[PDB]
């Protein structure tokens, strides 16, 4: 029961953005949690691009969860957790931030925002509220029709990807993740 | 030159403890190449870090080294044994015979156990799973062994259950860090009706956040047959207990369905109560 | 349910001639930095690599002399062999160079009087069994003690009567072994446990329907097994869950067909070899008992595996050590 990613996002037609994240590696290597939050933030932005509008998914990785959401507006989220965290919890978190996004940020600030323009502080204090489920507020007006039992799930992230498309090819051509993170990936790409 | 360059790395190691001994974990920094004039011994707070590059060189030379020591090729003084042995095992504490070079050194008077006791916690925080770290553990703590248990033991036994916790949380359902814990009340705390007890609850909230680990489940499953056995006025709540765990379990699987842990752990705590 | 998903593009077909042509390349390319890795179990290692290319009969191709040479120069004046040059004598390395040397019948190179003594000697007055000489029990050493002396001819050197009651002494009320008295069961403690029983002739103490359950419960949805509730399927599992099924008799309730494609699915089309998962790195560990645990199932271009030793039924016929198993 952990929450690892929590990040509101934005699909333009020419790229998505980032524009604010909040993360918790405090469960990873001391020496790695650094590399380990870029991928985040890689995942979260790679899940919105191969995702539409207005449809949820959930890609599924070993030992890793990232449920994206994104609305009927290019506005998205996405959260990553693990295989004991319930999806419907997930979606329930997603809602009502992207609820109290709009409420903050205007509607043209997202297409051109970034992460040092946008202001929200209370993406830490969810991601550490929603730690434990049994801790979540029960809005019932949210989960009572969220589901439509049509949200499309991945074994992997490959799944996303063309035919042709090879997922080595993205990270070290990427322009969030680092060199010593690309480099971390070299020695993941040996099947650790 | 690489036999002055490694040579110098068992001396930053060693200078690393003793100029901070409260060292929390030990990590690997990715690191393709060297830098100038620069250790690849770097500390940042109570973490420390070794670049990727010079493991490659630093571990084989250190397991040889050990091994001329075993064959009588090459002497070491016990203060040059306990230094290679120590950087050896914090790459590598499966390393079974490094190990029992510091039994010998243990058991010669030489090396105080409680530099093995804290050796072998560091390497769990890299490897968690290490089954030979907890063999030679158990090892350390009979000798430390030679009614309720003394201060110093029970100093002991909840040092050994933060271990044993944490090296849980690292790697999910450890078995080997479970059995260990359990090894811990049978040997040292001898089955204490209190101990038991505070296991049972300081383990309560982790259980409910790792709900996928029956090793952490079967804990709990241990810590109720041997209270059980204890009893053979705070005894008196052995069918209130059971009620409490089949409650607490009810209370898991219906806020988190799916899991074959949850119930496999109920399934186990109705056998305990038909069979009173 | 956490498991994996069998890709389409997965190997649905035995690669033996590649699974081959790994084993014999395997440590071929000179690393320093992973020879000291895994030196400390060196010994088990060539027994894996050894045991599988005679399982495919491709044991011709391994460097008989040197390895005979290398086991030779692991006795210790104990009279126990450790995993290799240098390193302290165990009960483990003791097993599996006793098993290299019965796959080459070359059992002479060593002292077998001073490994009896060895083994011997690591029993204590409850029936355990030590790992070695620093008192590690464990229901592993159990079954390399009886698994050594079975092979040797020697299982009356030690207390037999008293071994026995200290591994159903083990035995959880699930039906299930762990390694020590109070243990969670474990698939693979189990099949030392089993392996133990079956050797001394005491499998009527088993509840074969209790305990093929428990085993049974290991299968997941993708057809793989693992070692105990909500883990991921492995390769090794298969094995471990798959011998100790057919030691007690029960076999034959396991899902052949999906568990077949699980383990074929963990194959590696360019390099060969096993892995745990589909899509993870191979080694010959996987390699070996991937291939064993085709080889319970029935894959015809692989030789008969006995689920005790681990070992080409042929091999164990040729020393007269076969146990008896639950009918
Ligand atoms: C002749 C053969 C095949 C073996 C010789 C006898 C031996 C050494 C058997 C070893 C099998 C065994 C008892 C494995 C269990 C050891 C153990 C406790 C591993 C750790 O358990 P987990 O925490 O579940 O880790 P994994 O999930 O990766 O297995």
Same mark, same amino acid.
């Given at each position: 029961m952990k929450l690892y990613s929590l990040s509101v996002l934005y699909k333009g037609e020419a790229k998505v953005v980032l524009l604010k994240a909040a993360y918790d590696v405090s469960s990873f290597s001391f020496f790695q949690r650094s590399s380990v939050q870029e991928f985040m933030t890689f995942t979260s932005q790679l899940i919105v691009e191969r995702s539409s509008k207005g449809t949820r998914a959930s890609v599924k990785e070993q030992d890793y969860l990232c449920h994206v959401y994104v609305r009927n507006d290019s506005l998205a989220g996405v959260v990553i957790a693990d295989n004991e965290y319930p999806s419907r919890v997930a979606f329930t978190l997603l809602e009502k931030?992207?609820?109290?996004?709009?409420?903050?940020?205007?509607?043209?600030?997202?297409?051109?925002?970034?992460?040092?323009?946008?202001?929200?502080? *209370?993406?830490?204090?969810?991601?550490?509220?929603?730690?434990?489920?049994?801790? *979540?507020?029960?809005?019932?007006?949210?989960? *009572?029709?969220?589901?439509?039992?049509?949200?499309?799930?991945?074994?992997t992230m490959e799944s996303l990807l063309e035919r042709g498309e090879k997922l080595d090819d993205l990270v070290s051509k990427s322009e969030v993740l680092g060199t010593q993170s690309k480099a971390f990936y070299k020695t993941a790409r040996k099947q650790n | 030159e690489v036999a002055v360059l490694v040579q110098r790395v068992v001396k930053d190691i060693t200078n690393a403890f003793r100029r901070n001994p409260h060292i929390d974990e030990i990590g690997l920094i990715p690191c393709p190449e060297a830098r100038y004039?620069?250790?690849?011994? &770097?500390?940042?707070?109570?973490?420390?870090?070794?670049?990727?590059?010079?493991?490659?060189?630093? +571990?084989?030379?250190?397991?040889?080294?050990?091994?001329?020591?075993?064959?009588?090729?090459?002497?070491?003084?016990?203060?040059?044994?306990?230094?290679?042995?120590?950087?050896?095992?914090?790459?590598?504490?499966?390393?079974? /015979?490094?190990?029992?070079?510091?039994?010998?050194?243990?058991?010669?008077?030489?090396?105080?156990?409680?530099?093995?006791?804290?050796?072998?916690?560091?390497?769990?925080?890299?490897?968690?799973?290490?089954? =030979?770290?907890?063999?030679?553990?158990?090892?350390?703590?009979?000798?430390?062994?030679? /009614?309720?248990?003394? =201060?110093?033991?029970?100093?002991?036994?909840? =040092?050994?259950?933060?271990?044993?916790?944490?090296?849980?949380?690292?790697?999910?359902?450890?078995?080997?860090?479970?059995?260990?814990?359990?090894?811990? +009340?049978?040997?040292?705390?001898?089955?204490? &009706?209190?101990?038991?007890?505070?296991?049972?609850?300081?383990?309560?909230?982790?259980?409910?956040?790792?709900?996928?680990?029956?090793?952490?489940?079967?804990?709990?499953?241990? +810590?109720?047959?041997?209270?059980?056995?204890? /009893?053979?006025?705070?005894?008196?709540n052995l069918p209130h207990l059971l009620e409490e765990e089949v409650e607490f379990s009810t209370d898991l699987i219906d806020s988190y369905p799916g899991h074959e842990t949850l119930w496999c752990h109920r399934r186990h705590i109705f056998y305990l109560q038909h069979h009173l | 349910?956490?498991? @994996?998903?069998? #890709?389409?593009?997965?190997?649905?077909?035995?690669? %033996?001639?590649?699974?081959?042509?790994?084993?014999?390349?395997?440590?071929? #390319?000179?690393?320093?930095?992973?020879?000291? !890795?895994?030196?400390?179990?060196? !010994?088990?290692? $060539?027994?894996?690599? %050894?045991?599988?290319?005679?399982? !495919?009969?491709?044991?011709?191709?391994?460097?008989?002399?040197?390895?005979?040479?290398? $086991?030779?120069?692991?006795?210790?004046?104990?009279?126990?062999?450790?995993?290799?040059?240098?390193?302290?004598?165990?009960?483990?390395?003791?097993?599996?160079?006793?098993? $290299?040397?019965?796959?080459?019948?070359?059992?002479?190179? $060593?002292? @077998?009087? #001073?490994?009896?003594?060895?083994?011997?000697?690591?029993q204590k007055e409850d029936g355990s069994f030590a790992g070695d000489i620093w008192g590690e029990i464990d229901t592993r050493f159990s079954f390399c003690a009886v698994a050594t002396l079975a092979l040797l001819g020697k299982l009356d050197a030690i207390n037999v009567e008293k071994a026995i009651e200290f591994v159903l002494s083990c035995m959880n009320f699930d039906g299930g072994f762990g390694c020590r008295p109070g243990s969670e069961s474990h698939a693979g403690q189990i099949y030392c446990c089993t392996g133990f029983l079956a050797i001394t002739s005491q499998l009527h103490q088993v509840n074969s329907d209790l305990l093929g359950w428990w085993l049974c419960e290991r299968q997941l949805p993708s057809g793989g097994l693992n070692g105990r509730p909500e883990k991921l399927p492995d390769v090794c599992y298969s094995w471990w869950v798959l011998a100790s099924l057919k030691i007690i008799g029960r076999l034959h309730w396991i899902d052949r067909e999906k568990l077949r494609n699980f383990i074929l699915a963990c194959q590696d089309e360019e390099t060969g070899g096993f892995a745990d998962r589909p899509g993870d790195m191979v080694d010959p560990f996987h390699t070996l008992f991937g291939i064993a645990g085709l080889s319970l199932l029935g894959e015809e271009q692989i030789k008969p595996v006995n689920p005790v030793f681990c070992m080409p039924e042929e091999v164990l016929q040729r020393v007269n050590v076969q146990p008896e198993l639950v009918s």
């Open positions: 931030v992207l609820d109290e996004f709009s409420k903050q940020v205007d509607r043209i600030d997202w297409p051109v925002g970034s992460p040092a323009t946008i202001h929200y502080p *209370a993406l830490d204090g969810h991601l550490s509220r929603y730690q434990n489920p049994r801790e *979540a507020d029960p809005m019932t007006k949210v989960q *009572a029709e969220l589901d439509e039992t049509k949200i499309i799930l991945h074994n | 004039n620069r250790s690849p011994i &770097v500390l940042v707070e109570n973490k420390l870090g070794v670049e990727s590059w010079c493991v490659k060189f630093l +571990l084989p030379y250190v397991h040889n080294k050990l091994l001329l020591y075993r064959t009588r090729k090459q002497w070491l003084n016990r203060d040059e044994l306990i230094d290679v042995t120590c950087t050896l095992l914090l790459l590598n504490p499966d390393f079974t /015979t490094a190990w029992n070079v510091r039994k010998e050194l243990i058991l010669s008077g030489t090396l105080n156990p409680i530099k093995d006791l804290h050796l072998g916690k560091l390497a769990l925080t890299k490897f968690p799973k290490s089954p =030979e770290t907890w063999i030679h553990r158990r090892w350390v703590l009979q000798q430390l062994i030679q /009614t309720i248990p003394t =201060e110093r033991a029970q100093r002991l036994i909840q =040092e050994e259950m933060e271990v044993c916790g944490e090296a849980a949380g690292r790697y999910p359902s450890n078995y080997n860090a479970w059995s260990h814990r359990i090894w811990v +009340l049978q040997h040292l705390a001898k089955l204490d &009706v209190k101990i038991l007890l505070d296991e049972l609850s300081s383990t309560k909230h982790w259980a409910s956040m790792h709900v996928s680990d029956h090793s952490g489940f079967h804990y709990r499953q241990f +810590l109720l047959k041997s209270l059980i056995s204890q /009893t053979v006025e705070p005894r008196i | 349910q956490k498991d @994996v998903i069998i #890709k389409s593009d997965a190997p649905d077909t035995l690669l %033996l001639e590649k699974h081959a042509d790994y084993i014999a390349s395997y440590g071929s #390319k000179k690393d320093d930095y992973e020879y000291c !890795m895994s030196e400390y179990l060196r !010994m088990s290692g $060539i027994y894996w690599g %050894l045991t599988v290319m005679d399982l !495919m009969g491709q044991l011709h191709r391994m460097n008989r002399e040197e390895i005979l040479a290398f $086991i030779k120069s692991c006795q210790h004046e104990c009279g126990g062999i450790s995993a290799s040059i240098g390193h302290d004598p165990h009960l483990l390395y003791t097993l599996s160079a006793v098993q $290299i040397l019965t796959l080459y019948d070359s059992i002479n190179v $060593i002292d @077998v009087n #001073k490994v009896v003594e060895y083994v011997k000697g690591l």
